[PDB]
Amino acid sequence: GFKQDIATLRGDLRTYAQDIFLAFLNKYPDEKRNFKNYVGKSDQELKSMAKFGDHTEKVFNLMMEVADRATDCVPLASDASTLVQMKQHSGLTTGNFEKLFVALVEYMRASGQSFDSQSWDRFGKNLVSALSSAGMK
Amino acid sequence: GFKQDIATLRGDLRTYAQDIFLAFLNKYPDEKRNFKNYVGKSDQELKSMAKFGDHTEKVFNLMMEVADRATDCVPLASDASTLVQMKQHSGLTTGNFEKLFVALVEYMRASGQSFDSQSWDRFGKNLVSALSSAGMK
Ligand code: HEM
Ligand SMILES: Oc1ccc(Cl)cc1Cl
Ligand SMILES: Oc1ccc(Cl)cc1Cl
Numbered sequence: 001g002f003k004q005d006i007a008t009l010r011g012d013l014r015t016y017a018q019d020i021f022l023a024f025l026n027k028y029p030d031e032k033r034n035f036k037n038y039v040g041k042s043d044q045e046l047k048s049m050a051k052f053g054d055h056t057e058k059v060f061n062l063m064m065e066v067a068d069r070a071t072d073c074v075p076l077a078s079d080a081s082t083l084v085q086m087k088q089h090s091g092l093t094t095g096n097f098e099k100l101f102v103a104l105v106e107y108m109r110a111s112g113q114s115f116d117s118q119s120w121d122r123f124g125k126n127l128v129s130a131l132s133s134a135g136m137k
Numbered sequence: 138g139f140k141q142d143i144a145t146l147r148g149d150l151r152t153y154a155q156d157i158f159l160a161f162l163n164k165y166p167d168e169k170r171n172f173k174n175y176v177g178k179s180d181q182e183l184k185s186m187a188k189f190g191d192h193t194e195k196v197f198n199l200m201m202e203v204a205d206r207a208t209d210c211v212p213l214a215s216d217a218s219t220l221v222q223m224k225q226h227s228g229l230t231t232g233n234f235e236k237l238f239v240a241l242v243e244y245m246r247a248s249g250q251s252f253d254s255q256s257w258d259r260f261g262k263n264l265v266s267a268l269s270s271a272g273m274k
Pocket of ligand 2: 056
């Protein structure tokens, strides 16, 4: 289930963080505009860039903590406030987050592993609602 | 305290994992004999090798799972048994583990972050005692 999925992802975190972020960026090419330096690069080139590896790992490290602190796939309101108050997320909307979780769930469904994709879909929806309550447009 | 420390360490897992492993290896040079692929290389050389970062991340991730499952800094006997039974740990003794935790506590005290170094010291002592009870020499 959901809790075991967190353990699975953490056990190969750099690989999953990069694979999932790349799936997001290739499913939604417009989202690359939020990173500027990622345009015109293939996946293998991105994976060789310092800020790409460091950044995807930090995103995923924190995403797994938020997932781990949730109850029944509902994140804590304090974790949602943190994500909203981050300077780096000024200019983001909940739509950016919704798209991340659509790609993550699709990636899980296609991997052939025993992920509880339905719990991740609920988690993403519940996170987006929490982000709005915390003030994100 | 202990639980926040786990969150702090997990938030930047690869960076802490590398720095703590290097602190251990440089404090206890003889221990590097267990890691024949890392002999003859400076800290910066090791950090440039993908296999070093991957190895340290996987170890440290499991250490944080064990710490998170502990009650009052006492690890679960099942987690201690897992560590004893791993093939990669054939030939190790509790002494190797004690030295790791000395280096880890020394790293925390020196870092100038508000780690609960006393709790990591207790955790390391209780883990060493649990490894004995699970069959490690
Ligand atoms: C609580 C502490 C520890 C945990 C959680 C842990 C866990 C692990 C894990 C998950 C691996 C496999 C990582 C990989 O795939 O490369 C591993 C491998 C290994 N560990 Fe441990 N370990 C711990 C302590 C130690 C200590 C103290 C030593 C020796 C001083 C040690 C020696 C080794 C060796 C030699 C390998 C094989 C590495 C290789 O073949 O490249 N471990 N350990
Ligand atoms: O910016 C990111 C880095 C890693 C992951 Cl998994 C998702 C996002 Cl949006
Ligand atoms: O082999 C290791 C990798 C990372 C850390 Cl923190 C400790 C050890 Cl023994």
